């Protein structure tokens, strides 16, 4: 009777960058959604396709926990049917997404006085991301007709940019930690129930 490792995802000391978002496969455990009901004053708890009060009464085959960090102005894109640099090139949710999205302001954790350039995001990509696609490529983006051959310069730019989280920034430009819980139920034995 193992408990689902939700503490390991939310209470992790470091989160991954949005372009290389981490995914923890959670299965064969007893899930407690009452600790995610109401964590703190941050109430980023928009659930899509499923009700929060009904999660304890449902069993799922697998539960995926995706974690990353973006700015405040970009949390509105972590939702089904959204567009933008984050939604199109970093982390895209399907149109029929069934799950909940959680976010909280982590300005006291992920922002340094000199700028926390550790968190990155993808700026250039030739096409949009499919749902639940992770692109960790760092190939020099070819914005012109001349081939780059790994030479950074004009029309040949590095596809990743830094966030530079400073604690004095505006709320919209402060770091936010996001945890997306995907609920899957395909032809398989359901192992993640509530209690």
């Amino acid at each position, epitope marked *: 009777t193992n408990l689902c490792p939700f503490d390991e995802v939310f209470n992790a000391t470091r989160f991954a960058s949005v372009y290389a978002w981490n995914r923890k496969r959670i299965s064969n455990c007893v899930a407690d959604y009452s600790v995610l009901y109401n964590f703190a004053p941050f109430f980023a708890f928009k659930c899509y396709g499923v009700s929060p009060t009904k999660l304890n009464d449902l069993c799922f085959t697998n539960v995926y926990a995706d974690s990353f960090v973006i700015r405040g102005n970009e949390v509105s894109q972590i939702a089904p049917g959204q567009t933008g640099n984050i939604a199109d090139y970093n982390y895209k949710l399907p149109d029929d997404f069934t799950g909940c999205v959680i976010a909280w302001n982590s300005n006291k954790l992920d922002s340094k006085v000199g700028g926390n350039y550790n968190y990155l995001y993808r700026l250039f990509r*030739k096409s949009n991301l499919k749902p639940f696609e992770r692109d960790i490529s760092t190939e020099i983006y070819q*914005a012109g007709n001349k081939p780059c051959n790994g030479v950074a310069g004009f029309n040949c730019y590095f596809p990743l*940019r830094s966030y530079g989280f400073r604690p004095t920034y505006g709320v919209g430009h402060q770091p936010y930690r996001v945890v997306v819980l995907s609920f899957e139920l395909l032809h398989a034995p359901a192992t993640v129930c509530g209690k």
Partner: antibody, heavy 117, light 110 residues
Framework: QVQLVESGGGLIQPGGSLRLSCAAS????????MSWVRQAPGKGLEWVSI???????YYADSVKGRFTISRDSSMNTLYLQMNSLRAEDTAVYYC???????????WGQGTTVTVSS | EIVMTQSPSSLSASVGDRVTITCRAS??????LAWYQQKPGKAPKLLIY???TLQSGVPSRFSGSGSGTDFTLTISSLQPEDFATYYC???????????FGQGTKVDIKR
């Protein structure tokens, strides 16, 4: 030769339709953030529309429902279809390659659109 | 929408002066700002991007500074080819817009 060449501007009565073209060489339209910026006589710059390399488009509130940005990858050309034109649309229309955080580096020479009855 | 208030509207300067232009956003935009130069009848020219990074090919007398809401462009030694109109832009993609400043005309002081 890195340059943007605009065309299609001219005189048209209000409510008419007009299609601007932006022929590019050097920069690939289907691979870049391409933006349309206009400037009325004696006024400042105003952003109009943008088309992402992934296909996402975004329009200003004043031209939502009237303008449609597009591109022909085989022609390497950016387009701005302007319907329901109004007098306040009279401006020089620039097409430009947007680099987001790196500014807007490549500008066209501009085409003049005049809407008057 | 973000409102970019640029000041002064016009300023007079002789060759060699230290020129300063101010650009203020209505809310925190961190470092998402750019400066442009425009001469009558010509297309705009990118000078500074990312608030304080100098575009390639721009003379080193140009320099940007500031972060958050208050930004300043600085010409350390005004040259004859620098008499023009300058704009600031909010490259931040929220709320879209990419609002430009009102503009500052720099004429010849006499």
């Amino acid at each position: 030769q890195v340059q943007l060449v605009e065309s299609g501007g001219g005189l048209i009565q209000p409510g008419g339709s007009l299609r601007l073209s932006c022929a590019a060489s050097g920069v690939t339209v289907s691979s870049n953030y391409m933006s349309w910026v206009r400037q009325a006589p004696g006024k400042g710059l105003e952003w109009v529309s943008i088309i992402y390399s992934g296909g996402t488009t975004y329009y200003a509130d004043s031209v939502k429902g009237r303008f449609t940005i597009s591109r022909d990858s085989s022609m390497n050309t950016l387009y701005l279809q302007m319907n329901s034109l109004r007098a306040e649309d009279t401006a020089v229309y620039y097409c430009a390659r947007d680099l987001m955080v790196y500014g807007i580096d490549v500008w066209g020479q501009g085409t003049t659109v005049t809407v008057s009855s | 929408e973000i409102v970019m208030t640029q000041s002064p509207s016009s300023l007079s300067a002789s060759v060699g002066d230290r020129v300063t232009i101010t650009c203020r956003a209505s809310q925190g935009i961190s470092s998402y700002l750019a400066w442009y130069q425009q001469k009558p009848g010509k297309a705009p020219k990118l000078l500074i991007y990312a608030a304080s990074t100098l575009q390639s090919g721009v003379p080193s007398r140009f320099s940007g500074s500031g972060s958050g809401t208050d930004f300043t462009l600085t010409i350390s030694s005004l040259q004859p080819e620098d008499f023009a109109t300058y704009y600031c832009q909010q490259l931040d993609s929220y709320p879209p817009g990419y609002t430009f400043g009102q503009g500052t005309k720099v004429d010849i002081k006499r």
